[PDB]
Symmetry: D2
């Protein structure tokens, strides 16, 4: 069903993917737990804590090469604003490796990404921290497009005290066309640049800290 | 000073916090002290199924004028307002709970430095029913952070479907930051806005196959001219 | 045109219900027309007309299906006898003729008749129970019996009609025996449906609210039992 | 604080709801709660997984001591946790201030670390399943963690087994419920409508007599 799903993404600019596809084997539930626990190890860089690492997919190679460099710049002392690398235990997790393969194989079946070019596969580990006096928000705060032509948003975990963090789709900034709320681990939303998207701020009306753990898998060309 | 015993009206205490912050959350406890307010609330809620309405929301508008002379509320026969919607039904405006909410809002407004008790005031009432569907989210106008034209605005939640998601309120000192996140969930929970801060309400959605609602009542205070 | 039959077969669904004793049904089968959304709103608003009991409010009406007649007639009598528990208000005519309600009843009847549980050689009572559970912070809403049980009728359809956002609880439990809970079902959106047989026990968790206003759970029961 | 009228209310009602604000007065407590919340993934197994550890308070002894005289024992890291020691200290101070706990007999302060695991095909339920009174005259229920996918797990208070009088839903970490034997209570089964496993992580602090 990848053909009709890929075609749907190309026509709409976005696609909802349910988490059941990554939850077929019973062992995946324990692998998910291990991936989820790594988000308590992310070090703080205010509203959110994140880690970044990237793979290189050379044109004819079936393999993924973890770049020793993790510099991120954005289309836009302390100029580079470099981030910590993703823990090895997270990248070696077979569930994480299987997710990126799905993301990579799906990306290659779009007309957006060509298989005759060197691709950078970006992995963004983000933990949004929300507090009663300090809600979490992104930059940009409203509707926007990501630098990378294809982006996968995978929910990893969501505190029961969290409010917000809903995803918006807009063909243009004058009106919202779709409202998607990720609730279960591994629910997935794929973004293209044909539409703007946004994430609603994360809040809590509780005395404890609310969190929203997400994994971004982006696809862009090298140099 | 600390707190009050039993009845904790503390309107002056509330006003000081409102002017100091630019916004204020008010509990529904003050509007639900009489046992018939629960049945009057039900009648007010049922009126939102009569709002008629681009299918994002259904609206009705009416306004009162409070002259400096006496402390009365005069139902204006114009109802003209540019961002012409239907007037609010007579059964809704004569509902004693709606009148008591309006009265509570007016005396709160007059105790601010913003509202001149020596100017003729327009008390606007906006009855809004946001409608949301799985293929159609509902959003406000303006869509994002903004300030309203009226110096003091009361937002009263009237009803919220259990299938509704979103519709959370944001408070921002500037358009680059979110400083406070308030999600009204119980009927008659109130938010008062000043112009010292920006606000917004996130879009309303549903992951369910049925239609979701968010029913609000806005009470605005502005000078006639 | 040439179209495909989707969802699941009613004979297949009946087989699962018979082996399991219970069956969860999605609201999609009752929401195939856009007018159904309008009919749902009218049905939902009727629950604000139910009178208070003398932990909840309810109305009852029933149809009779005689074995030797294709017709279904609205009984003028509405006496409901429940051992260890007189009169009940009848369901408003506008609710019973609401095309969405009629379609639910006809779906339930067609499902009940295709089970081996219902003996087609007896006169049937098709009972309709319109129930609004009301919960407040000082008085949660509980039923009688309060825990696991079997209903008097061999086949019962539970249709969720409405649930206030301030309500907590009201979850459905399935137990093969009173010693263990086997399944947990939470009816969330309207027209979500759960069908019970007498092969298993069931219960509904109490309804509560931590809010200062009244919380509601609007239910429709369609039961199938023998006239005599 | 008010540790006087609250004990009277608990003695009169048979149960009492305590907010988590008293356990989260410092910002260091938030980090300790996370450490205690992370220890529930180490619990070994089924409807639920649990660990048990207890302290002995001798009448002549001036303080309670960890007993080292059946499930696994609670990890030392969880017991070394100052926030966990503060909760137990608060529980003991409250329990001792009641007229239900006899100060002439040796007291057992029991700690039950329980993780309720619920899947779409297997709900999680307590034993006993329905209204009951616990063996111990005073029991403290502390919520430690609750998955966002979880449904149920609501607490019921009943004067008799035929009625529900109070309905309490613990939702945020360290919210607390105290049970006496003057009323019945129960916890509704734990379920999920989601494809993932849902958890309800709890800490019980019970006071019972040695003999
Ligand atoms: Fe983005
Ligand atoms: Fe506004
Ligand atoms: Fe029943
Ligand atoms: Fe117990
Ligand atoms: Hg920020
Ligand atoms: Hg690795
Ligand atoms: Hg809270
Ligand atoms: Hg719209
Ligand atoms: Hg839903
Ligand atoms: Hg509430
Ligand atoms: Hg779910």
């Amino acid at each position: 069903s990848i053909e009709e799903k890929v075609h749907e993404f190309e026509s709409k600019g976005f696609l909802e993917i349910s988490n059941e596809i990554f939850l077929q084997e019973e062992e995946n539930h324990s692998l998910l737990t291990q991936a989820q626990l790594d988000y308590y190890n992310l070090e703080d860089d205010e509203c959110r804590a994140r880690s970044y690492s990237r793979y290189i997919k050379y044109v004819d190679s079936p393999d993924y090469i973890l770049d020793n460099s993790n510099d991120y710049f954005q289309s836009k002392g302390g100029k580079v604003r470099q981030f910590n690398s993703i823990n090895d235990s997270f990248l070696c997790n077979p569930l994480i490796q299987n997710i990126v393969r799905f993301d990579t194989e799906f990306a290659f079946k779009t007309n957006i990404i060509d298989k005759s070019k060197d691709l950078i596969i970006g992995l963004h580990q983000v933990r949004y921290k929300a507090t009663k006096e300090r809600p979490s928000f992104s930059s940009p705060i409203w509707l926007h497009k990501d630098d990378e032509p294809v982006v996968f948003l995978h929910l990893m975990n969501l505190s029961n005290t969290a409010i917000g963090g809903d995803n918006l789709i807009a063909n243009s900034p004058r009106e919202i066309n779709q409202f998607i709320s990720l609730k279960e681990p591994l629910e997935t939303l794929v973004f293209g640049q044909k539409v703007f998207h946004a994430v609603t701020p994360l809040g809590t009306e509780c005395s404890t800290e609310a969190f929203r753990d997400i994994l971004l898998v982006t696809f862009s060309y090298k140099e």
